Design a protein around this ligand. Structure first.
Ligand SMILES: CCc1c(C(=O)C(N)=O)c2c(OCC(=O)O)cccc2n1Cc1ccccc1
Ligand SMILES: CCc1c(C(=O)C(N)=O)c2c(OCC(=O)O)cccc2n1Cc1ccccc1
Lengths: 122, 122
């Protein structure tokens, strides 16, 4: 679900998910994928490519369970579709955390998103 | 295409179309439709509904020709899909101009688009 994804991004990056990443670059938030603009954008590219491989579940709405073992996000069992989905959300939240220092606020509100260059079908 | 649409919006409103409207409200720019926030937003809602009926061409990518008869945008060669595409774009550019008196910069970069209340069927 969008609300579990936002929780993980807030806990991993310390930033508000919607404001800092909701319109970021060519891949983060609304819209689809495009030529990634930096490391942070590449994370959202892989995450959207991750979402594309889910067959029988709705990433935006279908909820899932997850827990925290020390600093590690643990995805609880709940069908392979929701497991991979939690693993997609864990992946992007860790990814955004790992590349915080290359975050660039000049791509935060990318109002040229539809004019991004084409990308590959994942 | 988006190139002709942006040209119309610039000519009618005098504003940078991508910066001013690319992420505006719940309906303008990248993303889908949602509960409109104001009159400018409702222009984009109507325009997206207009695009929905163009099942025979690509509204974002397919180029077309237009010109001006005095102060009225005149859409050219009646290729059925491309003619109606041009008319969709002319309608929103005039709608945006006529509603500049309530344009709200607070909605310009709506990073909360995915949390907009769902819209009615077109
Ligand atoms: C990176 C943050 C992100 C997405 C990403 O992680 C991303 N890959 O862009 C994403 C998104 O992507 C999934 C998809 O397109 O279906 C769709 C919509 C919003 C999206 N926010 C912003 C957000 C997430 C959670 C709570 C509040 C705001
Ligand atoms: C309101 C302006 C607008 C769209 C609208 O007119 C609107 N109805 O939102 C729209 C758009 O809409 C079509 C759709 O979503 O399929 C999609 C993508 C960008 C869109 N920009 C911004 C823009 C348009 C043209 C040139 C440069 C920027």
């Amino acid at each position: 679900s969008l609300f579990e994804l936002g929780k993980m991004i807030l806990q991993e990056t310390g930033k508000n998910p919607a404001k800092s990443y909701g319109v970021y670059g060519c891949n983060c938030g609304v819209g689809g994928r495009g030529k990634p603009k930096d490391a942070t954008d590449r994370c959202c590219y892989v995450h959207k490519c991750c979402y594309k491989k889910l067959t029988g579940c709705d990433p935006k709405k279908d909820r899932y369970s997850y827990s925290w073992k020390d600093k590690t996000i643990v995805c609880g069992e709940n069908n392979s579709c929701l497991k991979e989905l939690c693993e997609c959300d864990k992946a992007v939240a860790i990814c955004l955390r790992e590349n915080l220092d290359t975050y660039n606020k000049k791509y935060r509100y990318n109002y040229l998103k539809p004019f991004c260059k084409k990308a590959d079908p994942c």
